[PDB]
């Protein structure tokens, strides 16, 4: 949990009366009780990497022990350890001094993969 804050707008389900002693001269209006926390992925390290190392399907958890029915294979991958977003800056003009109106900022992200497989022929 990085930071905490509350939502703006009307509370759809207000705090029960039994749980708060009403005030207060001032205040009197119960603050927004809709709390959400910002996440944070913390440290990314090479020791925590799951990829760039081979996996051998010695035994499968299910009954299908690695048989690619229909001659197809679905490989799902999620990798947030390489989520760095590159910032590009292109100049529209070059004024005598530095002016923000002369540049456009862009967001770009890239993903590089190399899928390697080793299959075994089987007869039925």
């Amino acid at each position: 949990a990085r930071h905490f804050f509350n939502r703006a707008g009307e509370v759809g389900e207000p705090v029960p009366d039994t749980l708060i002693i009403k005030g207060s001269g001032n205040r009197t209006s119960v603050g927004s009780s809709i709390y959400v926390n910002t996440p944070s992925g913390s440290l990314v390290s090479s020791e925590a990497q799951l990829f760039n190392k081979p996996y051998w399907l010695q035994k499968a958890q299910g009954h299908n022990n690695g048989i690619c029915w229909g001659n197809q294979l679905f490989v799902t991958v999620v990798d947030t350890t390489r989520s760095t977003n590159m910032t590009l800056c292109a100049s529209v003009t070059t004024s005598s001094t530095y002016t923000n109106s002369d540049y456009k900022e862009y967001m770009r992200h890239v993903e590089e993969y190399d899928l390697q497989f080793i299959f075994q022929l089987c007869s039925i």
Partner: antibody
Amino acid sequence: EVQLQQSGAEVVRSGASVKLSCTASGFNIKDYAIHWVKQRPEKGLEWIGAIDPEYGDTEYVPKFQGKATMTADTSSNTAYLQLSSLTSEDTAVYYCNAGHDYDRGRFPYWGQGTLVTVSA
Amino acid sequence: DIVMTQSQKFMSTSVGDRVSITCKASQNVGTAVAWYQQKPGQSPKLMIYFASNRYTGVPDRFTGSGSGTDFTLTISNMQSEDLADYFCQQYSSYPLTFGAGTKLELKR
């Protein structure tokens, strides 16, 4: 190659509406902040409002609120300025200006100018 | 409503001389001031924006200066093509306002 073409001069009787158009300012993904300026031979230049294509945001002047209505067509096009109950004080030349990409202050790209005459 | 007050409506000078046009603000606007040039029968052309930055186009002959509430446009050595109206504009807060007209005439 960055010029703005407008609707053209129009002679209108009092009590009728007129619609002015602009061109080549207001595209998808780009982005511009379009402004309109009124030029009265006595009051000089008067800012009307600021409209942003790709969002359709609208800001006006309390003097012109209820007098000037602003619209933006995201395809092509943009920027339509229409005035309702036209009086003798609306006889002026109206300009469609766009600072490059964004912002207020900058009007480096002006329209050709449209002379509106409200009289009988 | 920030009022833009320009000193003189007309201004005299001669070819080659140095001219300075003043623009006084009714409020502090930092450096959010722009200058425009308008010739008769034409649409205004942007000259200086952000107080002292020349727009793509405008020769080093034109120089802007000032901050807060006093702003000035200076034309170091003149040409015949510089005879036009000059406006100052405030864009610190809405509504945007302009100054009164200023006609530059030659003493030739």
